[PDB]
Amino acid sequence: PEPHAVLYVTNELSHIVKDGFLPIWKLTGDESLNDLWLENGKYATDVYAYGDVSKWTIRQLRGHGFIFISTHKNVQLADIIKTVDVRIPREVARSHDMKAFENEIGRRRIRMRKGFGDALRNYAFKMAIEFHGSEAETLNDANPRLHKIYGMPEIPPLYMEYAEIGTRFDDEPTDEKLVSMLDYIVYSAEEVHYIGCGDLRTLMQFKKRSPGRFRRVLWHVYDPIAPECSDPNVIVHNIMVDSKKDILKHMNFLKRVERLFIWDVSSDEWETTRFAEDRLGEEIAYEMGGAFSSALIKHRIPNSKDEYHCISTYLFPQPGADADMYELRNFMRLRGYSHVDRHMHPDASVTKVVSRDVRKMVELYHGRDRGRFLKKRLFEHLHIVRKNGLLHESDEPRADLFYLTNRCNMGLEPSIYEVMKKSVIATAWVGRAPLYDYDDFALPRSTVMLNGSYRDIRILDGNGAILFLMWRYPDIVKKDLTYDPAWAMNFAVSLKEPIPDPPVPDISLCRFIGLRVESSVLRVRNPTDLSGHLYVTLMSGAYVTDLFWWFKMILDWSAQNREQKLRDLKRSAAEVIEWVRNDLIAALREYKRKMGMREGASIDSWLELLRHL
Ligand SMILES: Nc1nc2c(ncn2[C@@H]2O[C@H](COP(=O)(O)OP(=O)(O)OP(=O)(O)OC[C@H]3O[C@@H](n4cnc5c(=O)[nH]c(N)nc54)[C@H](O)[C@@H]3O)[C@@H](O)[C@H]2O)c(=O)[nH]1
Numbered sequence: 001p002e003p004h005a006v007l008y009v010t011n012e013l014s015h016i017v018k019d020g021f022l023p024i025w026k027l028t029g030d031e032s033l034n035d036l037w038l039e040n041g042k043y044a045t046d047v048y049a050y051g052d053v054s055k056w057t058i059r060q061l062r063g064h065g066f067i068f069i070s071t072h073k074n075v076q077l078a079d080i081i082k083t084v085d086v087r088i089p090r091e092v093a094r095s096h097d098m099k100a101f102e103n104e105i106g107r108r109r110i111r112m113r114k115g116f117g118d119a120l121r122n123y124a125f126k127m128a129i130e131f132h133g134s135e136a137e138t139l140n141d142a143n144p145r146l147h148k149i150y151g152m153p154e155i156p157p158l159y160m161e162y163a164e165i166g167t168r169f170d171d172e173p174t175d176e177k178l179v180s181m182l183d184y185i186v187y188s189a190e191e192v193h194y195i196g197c198g199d200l201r202t203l204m205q206f207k208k209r210s211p212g213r214f215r216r217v218l219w220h221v222y223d224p225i226a227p228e229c230s231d232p233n234v235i236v237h238n239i240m241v242d243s244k245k246d247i248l249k250h251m252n253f254l255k256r257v258e259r260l261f262i263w264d265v266s267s268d269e270w271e272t273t274r275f276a277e278d279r280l281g282e283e284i285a286y287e288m289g290g291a292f293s294s295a296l297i298k299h300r301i302p303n304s305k306d307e308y309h310c311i312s313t314y315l316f317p318q319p320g321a322d323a324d325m326y327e328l329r330n331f332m333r334l335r336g337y338s339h340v341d342r343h344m345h346p347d348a349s350v351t352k353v354v355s356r357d358v359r360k361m362v363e364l365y366h367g368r369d370r371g372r373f374l375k376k377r378l379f380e381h382l383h384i385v386r387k388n389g390l391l392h393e394s395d396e397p398r399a400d401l402f403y404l405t406n407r408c409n410m411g412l413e414p415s416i417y418e419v420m421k422k423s424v425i426a427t428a429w430v431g432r433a434p435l436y437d438y439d440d441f442a443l444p445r446s447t448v449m450l451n452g453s454y455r456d457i458r459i460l461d462g463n464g465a466i467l468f469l470m471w472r473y474p475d476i477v478k479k480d481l482t483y484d485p486a487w488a489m490n491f492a493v494s495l496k497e498p499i500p501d502p503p504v505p506d507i508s509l510c511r512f513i514g515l516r517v518e519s520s521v522l523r524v525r526n527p528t529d530l531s532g533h534l535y536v537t538l539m540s541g542a543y544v545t546d547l548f549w550w551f552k553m554i555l556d557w558s559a560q561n562r563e564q565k566l567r568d569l570k571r572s573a574a575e576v577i578e579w580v581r582n583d584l585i586a587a588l589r590e591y592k593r594k595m596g597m598r599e600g601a602s603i604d605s606w607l608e609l610l611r612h613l
């Protein structure tokens with residue numbers, strides 16, 4: 001709503017910037033500390049800035065909201081040598097088009113959006129066990145043997161009891177049929193019996209394509225026509241399969257593992273054959289309900305039958321499958337050991353299918369130039385546990401990311417805070433901007449700042465948090481990590497996180513950019529320094545910082561002593577950019593004087609924590 005980035009460019013690139021209609025800061029590397037804070041403090045939109053920034057650290061530069069743009073991969077600093085955030089392609093200078101240039105900045109900038117979410121996420125796999133409002137991404141980096149991934153993802157087209165279908169959505173071309181099958185089924189199974197594995201280009205491309213989850217799986221692959229395989233996680237079977245005795249002989253019962261059953265089998269004048277192949281695929285699985293958690297059985301749709309039977313949990317259109325291709329896969333969940341609790345997905349049973357309702361089903365969702373999102377929601381739906389955060393009570397520690405402030409959750413604020421009162425790490429939208437690509441609403445910053453900050457719960461804006469995690473967990477969040485601080489500040493981040501001893505006023509906490517431009521706007525629109533300094537932060541709802549800690553840094557920490565207090569920075573490897581109980585309590589009084597009801601206990605709670613400490 002207010003937060004900007006400084007789009008710092010390098011020298012060769014500078015001259016053009018001068019053309020476009022956004023403001024240009026200019027340096028001049030001297031410039032004492034307190035210049036950059038008052039200058040930067042001017043610009044209300046994003047800016048461009050060029051010139052010598054030798055002397056500064058990075059955290060110092062990110063705290064200002066710098067984004068680094070050059071023809072070069074990097075740029076000298078005082079802290080370290082920072083990988084350029086946005087690299088302009090040569091020709092796409094050069095040529096000085098101002099628009100091509102700017103247009104260029106934005107893309108990468110949205111490409112940057114992931115970096116942020118990532119560091120965060122990455123912290124939480126270092127911390128939490130439950131995850132709520134998850135998706136394919138959080139899935140993608142989950143250790144399924146430890147993490148516990150929940151949410152309510154948007155559900156794919158299914159046949160069962162039961163139809164409702166479709167309805168149709170836009171989609172995109174994806175990995176070929178068979179591979180793209182593997183793609184959504186293989187998430188947590190430790191062992192995989194693949195019946196009918198053919199020439200194997202299938203399975204092999206899966207490896208050459210997504211190697212990790214290939215390699216943490218054991219693969220029995222049954223087929224007469226199957227080749228040899230050097231890969232030692234691939235016990236290859238050249239027997240053909242009519243029974244479960246062909247599969248049983250090859251399992252270790254002394255050890256509990258999640259096993260997966262994939263049946264994809266067809267022979268070489270009509271084809272009941274085709275049929276009693278699939279049925280068997282299934283039957284063999286069904287007998288072995290007891291060992292497998294799952295079955296991705298092939299299921300071609302008959303010509304000669306108007307409605308038929310089968311044992312199934314779900315039925316669905318396979319992504320990247322040819323339009324004419326009239327074959328859905330059947331998914332059967334089963335009783336048998338699993339790291340993902342699938343009980344919600346009903347215990348695979350007998351199912352009457354109206355061929356034509358299935359016919360239509362292929363007709364909406366199949367097509368070579370489709371499948372991308374289908375695949376997601378298939379994958380998403382199969383391996384996330386359908387549970388709802390605001391409502392769910394956890395015995396273990398949890399993470400609550402980028403789902404809380406979604407438009408579905410509207411008006412149920414109370415719960416949201418209760419979450420943030422005890423989530424390892426959760427996040428809320430706060431940005432008051434237009435603001436494309438993102439569908440959330442935002443919380444009054446003030447309200448966040450006050451409900452949010454607890455003894456255990458640290459309450460920063462996204463950037464603030466990034467800075468903090470850099471400073472506290474330097475190798476969950478490398479200093480070099482590319483992210484966009486502007487955007488990072490449309491987020492409110494909470495962390496189960498002790499206030500520092502000593503409460504050193506590190507950038508991660510103490511940034512407050514443009515608080516002066518912020519203040520005077522106040523006075524001319526709704527009128528009425530450390531005392532007032534506080535009132536603004538709240539009145540502005542430009543800022544989301546950790547009240548508690550900030551408090552505790554003032555009275556317990558500053559002053560104290562110029563001498564004795566830097567020193568306790570050194571040391572705490574902290575750093576800064578700006579270089580009494582009776583004051584603050586008035587701030588509060590005045591603030592809620594201007595806002596009964598529309599807040600905020602609490603306040604009351606906060607006041608009565610000074611008038612006690
Ligand atoms: N190695 C090997 N594999 C075989 C063989 N036959 C089928 N497959 C396996 O069938 C899968 C899908 O085939 P495709 O999608 O081309 O067609 P289907 O197998 O249904 O065709 P099929 O029923 O065997 O042939 C008759 C024709 O019916 C046509 N058809 C038209 N409308 C429909 C419909 O509504 N439903 C079905 N099932 N078929 C329809 C199909 O296009 C098809 O060409 C292939 O991936 C392969 O694994 C074979 O002889 N050798």
Ligand SMILES: Nc1nc2[nH]cnc2c(=O)[nH]1
Nearest residue numbers: 113114116117118137402
């Ligand atoms: N910043 C950000 N990163 C993400 N990574 C995946 N989803 C998101 C998101 O909504 N925001």
Ligand SMILES: Nc1nc2[nH]cnc2c(=O)[nH]1
Nearest residue numbers: 136140183184375376379
């Ligand atoms: N099946 C599947 N779908 C995805 N959608 C985005 N990433 C993935 C992935 O790794 N697997």
